[PDB]
Amino acid sequence: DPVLCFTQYEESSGKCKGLLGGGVSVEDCCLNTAFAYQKRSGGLCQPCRSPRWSLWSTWAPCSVTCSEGSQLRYRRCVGWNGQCSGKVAPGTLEWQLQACEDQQCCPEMGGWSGWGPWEPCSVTCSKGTRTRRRACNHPAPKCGGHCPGQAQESEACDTQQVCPE
Amino acid sequence: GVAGGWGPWGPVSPCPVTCGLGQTMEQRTCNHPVPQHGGPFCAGDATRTHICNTAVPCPVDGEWDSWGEWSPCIRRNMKSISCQEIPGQQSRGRTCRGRKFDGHRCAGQQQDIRHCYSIQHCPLKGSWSEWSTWGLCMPPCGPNPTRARQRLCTPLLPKYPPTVSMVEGQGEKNVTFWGRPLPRCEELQGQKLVVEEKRPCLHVPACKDPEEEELENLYF
Ligand SMILES: *[C@@H]1O[C@H](CO[C@H]2O[C@@H](C)[C@@H](O)[C@@H](O)[C@@H]2O)[C@@H](O[C@@H]2O[C@H](CO)[C@@H](O)[C@H](O)[C@H]2NC(C)=O)[C@H](O)[C@H]1NC(C)=O
Ligand SMILES: *[C@@H]1O[C@@H](C)[C@@H](O)[C@@H](O[C@@H]2O[C@H](CO)[C@@H](O)[C@H](O)[C@H]2O)[C@@H]1O
Ligand SMILES: *[C@@H]1O[C@@H](C)[C@@H](O)[C@@H](O[C@@H]2O[C@H](CO)[C@@H](O)[C@H](O)[C@H]2O)[C@@H]1O
Ligand SMILES: *[C@@H]1O[C@@H](C)[C@@H](O)[C@@H](O[C@@H]2O[C@H](CO)[C@@H](O)[C@H](O)[C@H]2O)[C@@H]1O
Ligand SMILES: *[C@H]1O[C@H](CO)[C@@H](O)[C@H](O)[C@@H]1O
Ligand SMILES: *[C@H]1O[C@H](CO)[C@@H](O)[C@H](O)[C@@H]1O
Ligand SMILES: *[C@H]1O[C@H](CO)[C@@H](O)[C@H](O)[C@@H]1O
Ligand SMILES: *[C@H]1O[C@H](CO)[C@@H](O)[C@H](O)[C@@H]1O
Ligand SMILES: *[C@H]1O[C@H](CO)[C@@H](O)[C@H](O)[C@@H]1O
Ligand SMILES: *[C@H]1O[C@H](CO)[C@@H](O)[C@H](O)[C@@H]1O
Ligand SMILES: *[C@H]1O[C@H](CO)[C@@H](O)[C@H](O)[C@@H]1O
Ligand SMILES: *[C@H]1O[C@H](CO)[C@@H](O)[C@H](O)[C@@H]1O
Ligand SMILES: *[C@H]1O[C@H](CO)[C@@H](O)[C@H](O)[C@@H]1O
Ligand SMILES: *[C@H]1O[C@H](CO)[C@@H](O)[C@H](O)[C@@H]1O
Ligand SMILES: *[C@H]1O[C@H](CO)[C@@H](O)[C@H](O)[C@@H]1O
Ligand SMILES: *[C@H]1O[C@H](CO)[C@@H](O)[C@H](O)[C@@H]1O
């Protein structure tokens, strides 16, 4: 079965670099153990050396940003015609799951308090703005929480007074 | 406007590699009908490549295997030397795995030997160590992974000379302990050897292909 043959294998990247050609069987391409092959070009680049386990990748991000989570890292057996340690076929993946913690607390949103009384109208003649503010401390937020909505309603008011001409 | 044309192909380069696959190429020039005034130009390519196949494999050098297990600690002409001040010698072996096709042989010593004291199955006084670091989540990609840390009965090694002169070898060689002793310790939570506690791991992520997982999060 033909396969694309590459002249160099870049470790820690899992990529075939330096294309030589296709239409050549896997046996001929892997006569030099420093080569690598990729079938159908979709992926699955594999070195020609004896199968040996690759390196543990960096930890995947913690499954949740809150309290205790779980994160994974993979390791693939790379090689041709052979088995890794443990009677494992080339292309198989091993995993290690680990508990992680980004931060201790997590945002518990607070509740709105009683409304502050209506502030006086922003102007003494014609029409103005009537502001109404409250606070977000019933209860108070922790970590990174915030109250839903806004903390200052604003309406209009008519003073029913004419300005001097 | 004078049409460009190709000349003769140059000599093909010899197969540069002495093993496996290589590559050859030929070099021709557009010097036979040279294009004039820039009207037309010679078409095609000025360099064709071919793959030269040599059936001989390539020398793959031998890489050392991981160390085997330490041999039992024995003294010559004394049979068992357990739980006694008797210096033995234990060996450890490697395997030059992978040397093929005139590859360079493995460099070093395939046999490691150290002087030892035997402590196999000896009853000793013990003491409970502190809580170990929380282990991994196991089984990964399995039903309900569970972490686990453990306190255990740490044996108290007998105060024997760690530095002994060997009469046969005329050397002052170090001695280390080897074996599985049977430690004695007051019961802690109803266990005489190792008491552990398990906690389930939270928000377990599914195990998918590193490429497939990458394409899945990107696509949402
Ligand atoms: C045990 O001894 C080593 C060195 O001596 C011996 O090593 C044995 C494995 C064996 O092969 C034997 O034939 C050989 O003589 C000590 O290593 C030394 O440690 C000190 C401090 O740790 C360093 O400063 C030295 O550089 C280092 N090497 C030498 C050559 O002295 C080792 O520490 C010792 N272990 C104990 C627990 O005492
Ligand atoms: C990661 O970062 C944290 C700061 C949070 O914003 C996380 O979002 C979620 O927030 C709610 C609180 O409303 C918690 O119940 C969730 O546990 C948490 O996932 C975010 O994922
Ligand atoms: C309150 O009383 C009213 C009767 C006005 O006298 C106001 O002053 C007027 O305010 C507008 C803008 O606020 C200005 O254009 C006028 O110049 C000023 O007379 C007062 O604030
Ligand atoms: C020619 O003879 C062979 C028997 C090998 O000894 C060859 O060595 C190999 O040369 C190629 C490059 O030409 C390298 O890819 C290999 O790493 C090397 O083993 C020698 O050239
Ligand atoms: C991952 O695990 C250890 C290091 O943590 C080594 O055996 C090796 O680097 C592997 O890739
Ligand atoms: C996870 O573990 C450590 C950092 O916590 C490093 O080895 C690396 O960043 C890995 O992703
Ligand atoms: C304040 O605003 C409304 C109630 O007025 C709710 O979204 C919630 O109780 C918030 O604390
Ligand atoms: C203030 O506004 C109304 C009452 O006017 C209610 O949503 C609530 O009592 C709030 O504190
Ligand atoms: C403003 O509006 C009325 C009085 O106009 C009352 O509900 C309260 O004083 C509020 O602050
Ligand atoms: C040179 O190359 C090929 C013939 O080898 C043609 O495309 C054409 O004759 C060009 O001049
Ligand atoms: C080079 O290649 C072939 C001979 O192999 C011919 O088409 C022609 O001689 C060209 O110059
Ligand atoms: C055996 O000795 C150590 C590990 O104990 C390493 O140098 C290496 O793994 C070797 O095979
Ligand atoms: C010999 O020494 C210890 C066991 O006592 C381990 O490091 C290992 O099994 C080695 O082969
Ligand atoms: C076992 O180990 C020591 C005594 O040997 C103490 O830490 C405790 O009694 C524990 O049960
Ligand atoms: C384990 O538990 C706590 C720390 O988690 C301490 O009492 C001590 O380190 C024990 O070994
Ligand atoms: C496991 O849990 C935390 C770290 O996640 C620490 O208390 C300690 O390292 C323990 O072994």
Give the pair of three-digit tokens for residue A66: 């809150």
Phi, psi of B219 (to 5 degrees): -80, -25
The Cα–Cα gap between A4 and A16 comes to: 10
E strand segments, B34-75: 47-50, 63-64
Provide the shortest C-alpha distance from residue B140 to chain A (in Å): 5
Q: What angle do CA A17, A20, A23 make, to 5 degrees?
A: 120
The Cα–Cα gap between B126 and B130 comes to: 13
Q: Where are the domains of chain B?
A: 1-58, 59-121+159-180, 122-158+181-201
The Cα–Cα gap between A87 and A74 comes to: 18
Chain Cα centroid distance, residue B213: 27
Tell the residue number behind the tokens 């940003």, with chain if given: A65
Interface membership of A162 toward B (CB under 8 Å):
no
Q: How was this structure determined?
A: X-ray
Q: Which resolution, in Å, applies to this structure?
A: 3.5
Distances (CA, A) of B160 to B110, B166, B175, B176: 30, 15, 9, 10
Write the DSSP string, B18-38: SSSB--EEEEB-S-SS--BTT
The domains located in chain A, with CATH, are 1-49 (no CATH), 50-104 (2.20.100.10), 105-165 (2.20.100.10)
Chain Cα centroid distance, residue A28: 42
Give the binding-site residues of ligand 16, using a 6 Å CB cut-off: A 99; B 133-134, 149
Write the DSSP string, chain A: -EEEEEEEEETTTTEEEEEEEEEEEHHHHTTSTT-EEEETTTEEEEESS--EE-PPPPPPPPS-SSSS--B--EEEEE-SSS-BTTTB-TT-EEE-BB---S-SS--B-----PPPPPPPPS-SSSEEEEEEE--S-TT--BTT---SS-SEEEEEEE-------
Closest CA to B167 of B75, B70, B78: B75
DSSP label at residue B82 = T
Query: Is B45 exposed, middle or buried (CB count within 10 Å of its CB: 0-12, 13-18, 19+)?
Result: exposed
Q: What angle do CA A27, A3, B11 make, to 5 degrees?
A: 80
Length of chain A: 165
Query: Is A152 exposed, middle or buried (CB count within 10 Å of its CB: 0-12, 13-18, 19+)?
Result: exposed
List of residues 6+ apart from A8 with CB closer than 8 A: A16, A17, A18, A34, A35, A36
Phi, psi of A58 (to 5 degrees): -65, 150
Q: Is the CB of B58 under 6 A from ligand 4?
A: yes
Q: If DSSP codes are grouped into helix, strand and coil, which group holds residue B219? A: helix
The Cα–Cα gap between A43 and B42 comes to: 38
Q: Which ligand is nearest to the CA of B44?
A: 10
When scoring A6, A30, A31 by the number of chain B Cβ atoms within 10 A, the one with the most, hence best to mutate, is A31
